[PDB]
Structures are given as structure tokens and as C-alpha cells.
A paper describes a structure:
Villin is an actin filament nucleating, severing, capping and bundling protein; however, the structural basis for villin’s functions and the characteristics of the actin polymerization nucleus remain poorly understood. Eukaryotic G domains are often associated with a ~65-residue C-terminal α-helical headpiece (HP) domain, indicating that this architecture was likely present in the last eukaryotic common ancestor. In vitro, villin can nucleate actin polymerization and bundle filaments.
Thus, the actin conformations bound to the separated halves of villin have relaxed toward the twisted G-actin conformation by 8.7° and 2.2° relative to VA3 complex subunits A3 and A2, respectively. (I and J) Comparison of actin subunit A2 (tan) with the G-actin structure from the V4V6-HP/actin complex (magenta, RMSD of 0.9 Å for 346 residues).
Author numbering:
A (entry chain g): 1 to 38, 52 to 59, 64 to 368
B (entry chain v): 376 to 385, 393 to 749, 757 to 824
Write the structure that this text describes.
């Protein structure tokens, strides 16, 4: 059976749950992190009253999250949580008690043999094959810049921005309604994400790329809705991703993902910065826009010295770099030393 | 009449590399200590962790190298990185962690192996299953090359004749016997390690010189075919102009060319454009994922290189363009070992010519306006948006029309079309499907 004990890994994602068995190329089950009421969970949801447990990358509906974990364990993965150890991901700056209630929830309503909690961004550097670097994990609802040196995070520079995937999709709905369309049937929100994920891209020079949009139709592409209608998206293709660099588009006053990375790197030691500049690893589904690596090299090269080599790292499979990291970490046959046994729970509490 | 002071304004092996080394290799999601017997042998499909402990001036400090093979899967790279932390944490944090990737090893790393490193092509299974080509074989070919001293590497190449290069030596292990091919520019240090490697054969070696290649040789390499036989590579760098490579990119916001020294295949980024100077030829390597802004500026800036050449221009010097995956054996020779499994699907240049049609693989060579100066394409050509003939100003596609056919579509001459208002020009163009 599983005397080797088949392990499990779950990425607690703000908008998408990525989970699977350890030792696999990629997660087997990816389902949205939503709980719905008139129970209703997953893409099966979309009159409803939706809620997001991890809306900002930290769990707030603590016991409500149990239902999501249940949906993962029993229906998506088709597994018995009592027989398999588990690897759970945590945000870069999770509450010290956030982990503890996770520890308890696993050991109680599911009777897991063991468990471990790992930082989402430290897992991402492992898939990249590096120990030193600054990661940008641009997810559905939250983004974090986490400098990591020799395997462990530097919390004096961990930074956070709440501009992410879901905000971009909504801004696309707006500018597309400005283009003269009208899709707000709640189910049609996914059609817009399909438009975003396939036809959008990041521009090296927003102004120049916006000018060519009115003097030509080169950047113009076409999308077939399920009603058979062919709509045309033009300057919106680069406007939606440009919000990440100019948060004023949706109304925020924060800095863009280019400035936050500079601020985070500078809050560190001068000597570790070069490696942090030459190992700017990218993670998250919102770092999968065409050209985001080029602009991030451009913007950072400006705010930085003239003699600093900037290298933006973009692993091809970064939409699941966190999961791929845990599958690597859990499958380590030396991870039993860091597993937390059920006996250790009973003796020491969640601690 | 003045010296711009900005002219002036424009790393070491901490020890001899003679300290102790503990090479661990990533096998089955765990570290397996390599036998001392297999030291100096790394498999390009597996990752390795090396523990170098040294005391300089009575001061014991630690360095942990994690060598990541070019074909090592994501699972092995993470295990290599994850355990370098653990061996660092075991030393309490006293270790400096260094990442090494194949073909770009630092000076201290190669010094740990006395500059003699053998990188087989193969490796253990990735993600926990299947093929384990842990045997070089009874028949393989090795490539000995040295950019500078302290880096004399032997890498397994496909046992084919195309893989042969003139600036380097080769060692063929066959069932019949071991032979050592020698090139016109084979440095002594390269030739030596070949003999040292070939001496391991209980049967011995039979040195062969370029030109004096007997027929029993090619029957083991499958047969003869054009290899890296360029004038620059045959000679020694004492006399031929040093092969140089430049990286052209707009990623910094400004189009720039930056030199890459000790250049190898890994230094090529598929997202930017590169130019290689070989005196006899200047190549333009076009990244498949490269920008059209980058491509054109590189094609032009290459011409500004021939002109400002501080020597004999030889103005008919072929400035040829090459595409990722269609590299000729003479472009690869200025680089070290060329891997076809990366962008050419493991097919030699000849095998590529057969399938891709030879003509399609042919290297093209580099060679605001009035209406006449604009190339006139038919209306049906400009009205489409789908892979139209390149070299078209998609902003002003109206100019690529003829003066005659212009008056049938728009009802006016281009002389009057431009004197019309701008909102009318953009409106009339969109009406005629030429925006
Ligand atoms: N190809 C793509 N292009 C642009 N955005 C994408 C692409 N694929 C996914 N996304 C966006 O990435 C988000 C999911 O990222 P993810 O890493 O799952 O977030 P989290 O880990 O915080 O749950 C989604 O909101 C989606 O809109
Ligand atoms: Ca995430
Ligand atoms: Ca391998
Ligand atoms: Ca250390
Ligand atoms: Ca040589
Ligand atoms: Ca580029």
C-alpha cells in the first residue's frame, strides 16, 4: 500500500486551490477557493452569496476554510486524509497563530498523521533551483515581494500589495464595457478571464504602445464568445496588465510591482543585493503575462545603479511553482525529521 | 584635444582548490555520496552538491556548491538547493552557497578538480521513474576544450562526425579501439587530457591528425559529414582574430550591445539577439522569442560594426542571419559544445536539412519614404491582417499601395489623401480595411 506513505501537498491560494500528491510533475487538482451559500463549493458555484476565505492571502473564515480543505481531500483528490501526510503552504507573513489553527484543524477534523507548514515564496525558489533571490508571487488577490537568502526569508523586506489577478479581470470588464460590450452575468466573468489570459500582454513602453493603437490595428486581436460573436480587443490588451505597474488605474495609491521590488531589495544588506538583483524569480499566475519580464528589467534598471546586472527569472511553469516546490520538499526522504507527529500535537498542543 | 575622464570611469579563487571535496549527487529525491572513484565525473542530467571545506590562514570556512545539470529536472534542482541549506544549517550558517550551472562553472569550482572535469551526457530518472542512462557505453565520443587554463573539460557529444571541431580534440571509445582525433588548433593542455582519458583503455589509443583520418574511423562515427571546419577555428588564437559575441537587447529600455566573454551555448538567451564576429563571417542569431525591434536594430548595428572596424573592413564580409534551431556547424564552432536537444530536437544540421528542405534552412544574408520608395503590394495583400508580407509599415499601409489602384479604392491621389485631415485619414483607411 503506502508504507512509504504517499504524501500530499496543498497550496492555500487566495483565488485558486492547487493540490496534489507529492512526487508529481504538477498538481492533479486545481479548483477555485470559494464557498457559496443560497453547501456550494468550487466552479460548481457560478442567486448566491459568495465569500472568499483567503481573499487577501491570509485566512479569516478559519473554520470555513475546513470545508475547502474537505472538498480538496475527499472530492477533488479522492483521498482519505487519515492515511496520507500533508504539506500546507502559508503566506509570507502568516500570523504565528494562523499556522497553529491550521496545525489543529488538520490533526482534528481529519486525523492527519503528520503535517508541515512552509512559506509559499520559499517553495518557489526551490523550483527555480536557487537559494538566494527575491520572489514576486502575483496571485489572484494578493502579491508579495519576499527576499530570500540562503534558504530563509528576510522579513525586514517582505512587502505586500493587494493588486492582483481578480482586480485586473474587473478592470478588463470596465474597459471592455467602455469598448461597448456588456458581460456581467457572473458566469461571463470567466469569459473575460479567458480574454485576459490569452490575448493580453505587458508593454515595454505604455505610452508608445498606446499611440500605435490609434494609428493602426496591429495590436488588435479577436475573441469568439460562446454565443459565436467575435469581439475585438485593442488597447485593452496592455492596459489590463499595466495596472500592476500603475496602481492608479483601478484607484489605488500604492506603488507598482516595479517599485515594491526596489524598495524590498534596498531594505536589505548592500552585499546580498547583487545576488538579489541577479535572481529576481517570478511566481504566480499573474506573472504569466507576455513581456512582464522585459518591463520589469527595464523599470528596475532605471531605479537601480548603472553597474547592477538585473536578471528577471521567469520559470516556464510558474503558475504552480509553489506546488512544485512542496512536491519536491515533501518527497524528500529527509522530511520525516521536520514532520510534526500526532503524538507531538497531543503532548505540546498545536505549538 | 581632451580625454573624457569617463574613459577611466567606465573575484578570485579564495584558495588553491586543494581542500577536501564531498560530492553528493541527487538520486531518488535524496543525496547519495559519490564514490571517490567517480570524482571528476558529473552527469548533465543529474544535479550534484559539493561540500568544499578549507582553512586559509588557520581559518576554517565553508562553501557549498550545488551544480545543476542542463538537463536536470526541476525535482533534482530543488533537492540540490534544499540540501545545500541543510548542510549549511548543519554548519550553523557558516557556509556561503554558490549555484553552478553546466558550461558556466566558476574558476574556484574547476580548481577543485585540478581543471579536469568530465561531464557525461545522461543521468538518473527525474520525478522518480524510468530511463536511467547511467552508462556512457561501450561506444561514445568526448569533446576536450579549454577557453582559458584551469578549464579543460571533457563532455560527451553525439557520436557523429558533425560534432567534431577544429579548435579542440576528441576521444572516440569504440568496441574495436580508442582513437584520439587532433585538430589544427588543439592546445597541448587539451591534447594531454585526451591522452590521459584515453590511457584508461586497456587497449590503448591511436592518435589521428586532421586530414590523416583513416577510413576505419568514420565507419564508427557513422560516416563523414561537414564539421566545424572554419578558418578561424583551424588556426590558433595567437594569429586569428579572437572570436567575440555580443548581446543586443532593449530590455534595459535602451537598445544596447554587451560583450559576453568565454561565451558558450547557455549564454544565448532565446529572448534577445546576438552577433558573433569571426573575421571571415559575422553572424546574427535571431531568438525565436525575440522582438522585431531588437532584430532590426541588431541587423543594422551589425553593419556599423563592419564600418567602424579599426582594421581592414573587407566590405563584402558576409553578415549572415541565423535562426534558433537552424545553426550551421561553423556558427557552433566558436561556441564550445552545442546541444541539439535544446532547440533543434536532437537532429544534426544535416538531418535538419533533409526534413526542413535545405532551402528553408538557408541563411539569409543582410544586404518615412516617398511613394516610389515604398514596396507596392497588391490591395488583397494589404487588406489582410494574417501573416502578410513582412517589411510593411502596418501604421501606414496605404503607402504600400500603387498610385493607380489608390484612386480606385479611395477616390483620390495620395497627394490629396495626406492633405486631408488626420481624423479623415484614419476614418477613410478603416473604411477601406487599411488601418
Ligand atoms: N496565462 C495567464 N495570463 C494572465 N493571467 C493569468 C494566466 N493564468 C492565470 N492567470 C491569473 O492568475 C491568477 C491565479 O494565480 P495563482 O498563482 O493561482 O494565485 P494564488 O496562488 O494567490 O491563488 C488568476 O486570477 C488568473 O487570472
Ligand atoms: Ca499563491
Ligand atoms: Ca536526471
Ligand atoms: Ca550560511
Ligand atoms: Ca580549444
Ligand atoms: Ca527582449
Amino acid at each position: 500500500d503506502e508504507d512509504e506513505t504517499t504524501a500530499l501537498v496543498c497550496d492555500n491560494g487566495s483565488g485558486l486551490v492547487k493540490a496534489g500528491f507529492a512526487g508529481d510533475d504538477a498538481p492533479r487538482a486545481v479548483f477555485p477557493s470559494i464557498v457559496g451559500r443560497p453547501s456550494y463549493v468550487g466552479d460548481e458555484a457560478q442567486i448566491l452569496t459568495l465569500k472568499y476565505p483567503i481573499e487577501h492571502g491570509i485566512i479569516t473564515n478559519w473554520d470555513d476554510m475546513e470545508k475547502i480543505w474537505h472538498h480538496t481531500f475527499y472530492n477533488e483528490l479522492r483521498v482519505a486524509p487519515e492515511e496520507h501526510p500533508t504539506l500546507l503552504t502559508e503566506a509570507p507573513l502568516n500570523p504565528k497563530a494562523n499556522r497553529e489553527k491550521m496545525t489543529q484543524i488538520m490533526f482534528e477534523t481529519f486525523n492527519v498523521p503528520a503535517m508541515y507548514v512552509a512559506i509559499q515564496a520559499v517553495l518557489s525558489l526551490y523550483a527555480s533551483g536557487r537559494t538566494t533571490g527575491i520572489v514576486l508571487d502575483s496571485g489572484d488577490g494578493v502579491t508579495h515581494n519576499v527576499p530570500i537568502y540562503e534558504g530563509y526569508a528576510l522579513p525586514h523586506a517582505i512587502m505586500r500589495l493587494d493588486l492582483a489577478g481578480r482586480d485586473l479581470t474587473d478592470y478588463l470588464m470596465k474597459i471592455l464595457t467602455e469598448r461597448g460590450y456588456s458581460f456581467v452575468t457572473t458566469a461571463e466573468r470567466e469569459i473575460v478571464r479567458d480574454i485576459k489570459e490569452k490575448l493580453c500582454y505587458v508593454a515595454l513602453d505604455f505610452e508608445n504602445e498606446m499611440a500605435t493603437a490609434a494609428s493602426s490595428s496591429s495590436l488588435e486581436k479577436s475573441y469568439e464568445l460562446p454565443d459565436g460573436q467575435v469581439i475585438t480587443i485593442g488597447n485593452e490588451r496592455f492596459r489590463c496588465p499595466e495596472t500592476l505597474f500603475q496602481p492608479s488605474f483601478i484607484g489605488m495609491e500604492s506603488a507598482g510591482i516595479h517599485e515594491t521590488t526596489y524598495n524590498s531589495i534596498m531594505k536589505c544588506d548592500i552585499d546580498i543585493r547583487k545576488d538579489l538583483y541577479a535572481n529576481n524569480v517570478m511566481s504566480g499566475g499573474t506573472t504569466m503575462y507576455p513581456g512582464i519580464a522585459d518591463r520589469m528589467q527595464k523599470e528596475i534598471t532605471a531605479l537601480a545603479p548603472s553597474t547592477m546586472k538585473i536578471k528577471i527569472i521567469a520559470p516556464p511553469e510558474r503558475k504552480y511553482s509553489v506546488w512544485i516546490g512542496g512536491s519536491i520538499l515533501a518527497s524528500l526522504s529527509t522530511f520525516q525529521q521536520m514532520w510534526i507527529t500526532k503524538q507531538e500535537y497531543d503532548e505540546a498542543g498545536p505549538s | 584635444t581632451k580625454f573624457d575622464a569617463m574613459t577611466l570611469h567606465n573575484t578570485g579563487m579564495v584558495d588553491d582548490g586543494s581542500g577536501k571535496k564531498k560530492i553528493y549527487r541527487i538520486e531518488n529525491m535524496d543525496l547519495v555520496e559519490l564514490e571517490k572513484r567517480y570524482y571528476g565525473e558529473l552527469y548533465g542530467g543529474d544535479s550534484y552538491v559539493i561540500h568544499y571545506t578549507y582553512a586559509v590562514n588557520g581559518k576554517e570556512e565553508h562553501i557549498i556548491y550545488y551544480w545543476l545539470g542542463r538537463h536536470s529536472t526541476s525535482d533534482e534542482r530543488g533537492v540540490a538547493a534544499a540540501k545545500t541549506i541543510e548542510i549549511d544549517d548543519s554548519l550553523g550558517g557558516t557556509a556561503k552557497q554558490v549555484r553552478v550551472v553546466q558550461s558556466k562553472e566558476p574558476n574556484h569550482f574547476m580548481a577543485m578538480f585540478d581543471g579536469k572535469l568530465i561531464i557525461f551526457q545522461g543521468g538518473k530518472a527525474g520525478w522518480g521513474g524510468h530511463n536511467s542512462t547511467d552508462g556512457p557505453g561501450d561506444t561514445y565520443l568526448l569533446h576536450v576544450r579549454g577557453t582559458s587554463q584551469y578549464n579543460t573539460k571533457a563532455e560527451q557529444v553525439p557520436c557523429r562526425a558533425e560534432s567534431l571541431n577544429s579548435n579542440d580534440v576528441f576521444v572516440l571509445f569504440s568496441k574495436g579501439g580508442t582513437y584520439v582525433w587532433a585538430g589544427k588548433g588543439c592546445t597541448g593542455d587539451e591534447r594531454e587530457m585526451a591522452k590521459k582519458i584515453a590511457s584508461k583503455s586497456p587497449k590503448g589509443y591511436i592518435m589521428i591528425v586532421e586530414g590523416q583520418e583513416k577510413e576505419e574511423f568514420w565507419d564508427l562515427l557513422g560516416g563523414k559529414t561537414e564539421y566545424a571546419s572554419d578558418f578561424s577555428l583551424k588556426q590558433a588564437e595567437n594569429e586569428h582574430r579572437p572570436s567575440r559575441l555580443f548581446q543586443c537587447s532593449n530590455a534595459s529600455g535602451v537598445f544596447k550591445a554587451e560583450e559576453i566573454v568565454d561565451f558558450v551555448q547557455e549564454d544565448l538567451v532565446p529572448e534577445d539577439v546576438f552577433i558573433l564576429d569571426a573575421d571571415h563571417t559575422i553572424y546574427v542569431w535571431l531568438g525565436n522569442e525575440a522582438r522585431n525591434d531588437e532584430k532590426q536594430m541588431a541587423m543594422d548595428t551589425a553593419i556599423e560594426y563592419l564600418e567602424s572596424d579599426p582594421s581592414g573592413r573587407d566590405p563584402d564580409t558576409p553578415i549572415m542571419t541565423v535562426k534558433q534551431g537552424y545553426e550551421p556547424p561553423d556558427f557552433v564552432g566558436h561556441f564550445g559544445v552545442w546541444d541539439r536537444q535544446l532547440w533543434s530536437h536532437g537532429m544534426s544540421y544535416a538531418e535538419l536539412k533533409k526534413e526542413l528542405g535545405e532551402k528553408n534552412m538557408s541563411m539569409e544574408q543582410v544586404r518615412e519614404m516617398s511613394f516610389s520608395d515604398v514596396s507596392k503590394y497588391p490591395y488583397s495583400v494589404l487588406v489582410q491582417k494574417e501573416g502578410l508580407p513582412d517589411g510593411i509599415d502596418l501604421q501606414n499601409k496605404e503607402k504600400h499601395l500603387t498610385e493607380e489602384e489608390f484612386e480606385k479604392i479611395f477616390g483620390m491621389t495620395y497627394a490629396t489623401f495626406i492633405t486631408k485631415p488626420a481624423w479623415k485619414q484614419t476614418q477613410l483607411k478603416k473604411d477601406k480595411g487599411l488601418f
